[PDB]
Every structure is written in C-alpha cells, then in structure tokens.
Amino acid sequence: HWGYGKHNGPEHWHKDFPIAKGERQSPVDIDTHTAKYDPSLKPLSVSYDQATSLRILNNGHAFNVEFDDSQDKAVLKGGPLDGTYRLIQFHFHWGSLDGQGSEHTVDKKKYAAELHLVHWNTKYGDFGKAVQQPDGLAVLGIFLKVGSAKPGLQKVVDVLDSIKTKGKSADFTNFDPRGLLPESLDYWTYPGSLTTPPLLECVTWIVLKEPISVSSEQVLKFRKLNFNGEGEPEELMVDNWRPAQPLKNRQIKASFK
Ligand SMILES: NS(=O)(=O)c1c(F)c(F)c(NS(=O)(=O)c2c(F)c(F)c(F)c(F)c2F)c(F)c1F
Ligand SMILES: NS(=O)(=O)c1c(F)c(F)c(F)c(F)c1F
Ligand SMILES: OC[C@H]1O[C@@H](O)[C@H](O)[C@@H](O)[C@@H]1O
Ligand SMILES: [Zn+2]
C-alpha cells in the first residue's frame, strides 16, 4: 500500500517500515569533494555477455525487466565486492520533468532518471536469503540525462505501451543490458539499502559517475505509464523516486583518483 503520492509516499513509509529511519538508508547525496579515492578497490567487472532477459512487468511502482538468475549468466564482480553477484532485474526511477527523477544526487544535482541493475550475492543461494544479509545485494546505479537518444534503451521504450497498467507483463527476451551502460565504469560506492519498501539494509551501492544520455522522447514514454491497474482511476507513473537520506556514519569511496 506504499507508493509515491502525497498520502503514501516516502515521508509515510516509516509507519510500516521503521527501518526507513535506519543507519544505512539509500539513496544519498554524493558529495564529490568529500568522496575519497580508494586505491584498494579491485577492478570492477561487469560480465553481461550471457544474460538471459525474460520479461517486463509494470509492478505499480516502476517497470522491471527480469532475468534468468539460475546460473552465473550475467554477473558483477570486483570493485568493492567480495565474490560474485548475479543480475536478477533492472528498473528505473524518473521524474515528471527533466529536472528531477534520480534517487542519488551528485553535489545535490538531480538527474532526469536513474537506472538500477539489481544483483544478489551467490554465496546466499537465492535473492530471498540474500536480503537477510548485510552484503546480500549489489545495485549498479546509472544516471540518465536528457540529450541524444540511447539506442540500447529503445527496445524498452517501445514495449511500454503493452504494460501500461499495474500487473501487466510482456515477453522481453533477447535484450542485452550492455546497451544501457555509459563508456566509463568510474564509480562511487557506499553501503546502503533498498530505496523502496521494505528498505532493507543489504546493498552495496555502485553508482557510475558518467550518466547515459537518453532523448526527451524516450523519457516521455516512461511518463505515459500508469501506477494504477486497468479499470481503475488513471494516475501517471512519474516521480517514483525516494529523496536523499541522511549519510550518518558512512563514507563514499571513489574508484578514480
Ligand atoms: N506506510 S505506507 O506508506 O506503507 C502506508 C501509508 F502511508 C498509508 F497511508 C496507508 N493507508 S491506506 O489506507 O493504504 C491509504 C493510502 F495509502 C493512500 F495513499 C490513500 F490515498 C488512502 F486514502 C488510503 F486509505 C497504508 F496502508 C500504508 F501501508
Ligand atoms: N531501488 S533498488 O534498486 O534499491 C530496489 C532493489 F534493489 C530491489 F531488490 C527491489 F526489489 C526493488 F524494488 C528496488 F527498487
Ligand atoms: O584513520 C584513517 C582512515 O580514516 C578512515 O575514515 C578513512 O576511510 C581511511 O581512508 C583513512 O585511512
Ligand atoms: Zn531502484
């Protein structure tokens, strides 16, 4: 029953998810000058060559592209991570206008949207067990700015008309998530949480410094989705982002000097 509106949005979540006021909540503002280079970080490895996308779903909060995670087909390793993390899904957060939409901010700057590639630590066997662990998940976050079109996003944009309302799903096989990455893998990293209820504090965040460019037309199609189900009052799926939360006793590390 949580959402993003005035009556059930981020400022209400703590009533049912008290960890919302916890010590390692996400997202955060990334102060680029306070972030510190860490020469200890190992090289980051995004290995998506054998990814198997399955389907796309409007879950009433965002849309998720789900992957076969029954083997080590698309994995994230290295950087701050110990061991292997397997891609399970990606989704976005976006705004009603280009000046807002991201969850993380960079020196308080908000981007038009933010892509999250969600991975779970294979040492825990399944996603559900992983979210009982302080190092259960790794989320690769990528900012979107509006400018030139992103060709590798277009297949996503074009299927959205078929999942307009909550509960609708569609086939989404043979999608390559490598087409959503920027050129550089420079990143910031810190320990945090899911940014949606249940807000569990299980995530190693890896936020890429380089945004991807998408066209206005691409993001406008995100904004034609509905939060509601078919046959219910229409409410546009926009502003599905949680604002920055207190950093508390954390440090953000940079992969780049
Ligand atoms: N803590 S929370 O965000 O998860 C949450 C919440 F903050 C709530 F307020 C409810 N209350 S509600 O009854 O569902 C309800 C709404 F959520 C509405 F948005 C609304 F417009 C209503 F009229 C309404 F009745 C709720 F259940 C819930 F879990
Ligand atoms: N925003 S997020 O990347 O923190 C995130 C998750 F990591 C997750 F596993 C989910 F199930 C979500 F719904 C979600 F929004
Ligand atoms: O005590 C010194 C140490 O302080 C820590 O907070 C920093 O993360 C380290 O990089 C530093 O070496
Ligand atoms: Zn997310």
Q: What is the domain partition of the chain in residue ranges?
A: 1-257
Where are the extended beta strands (E) located within the chain?
29-30, 36-37, 42-47, 53-58, 63-67, 75-79, 85-94, 105-106, 113-121, 137-146, 169-171, 187-192, 203-208, 212-214, 253-254
Surrounding residues of ion ligand 4, Cβ less than 5 A = 116
State whether the beta carbon of 251 lies less than 6 angstroms from ligand 3.
yes
Atom of ligand 1 lying closest to residue 3 CA:
3
Between the CA atoms of 9, 227, 211 and 251, what dihedral angle is there, to the nearest 10 degrees?
Answer: 30
Distance CA 231, CA 96 (A): 23
Q: From ligand 4's centre to the CA of 41, what distance in Å? A: 24
Annotated ligand binding at 91? The verdict is yes
Helix/strand number for the chain, H first, E second: 3, 15
What experimental approach yielded this model?
X-ray
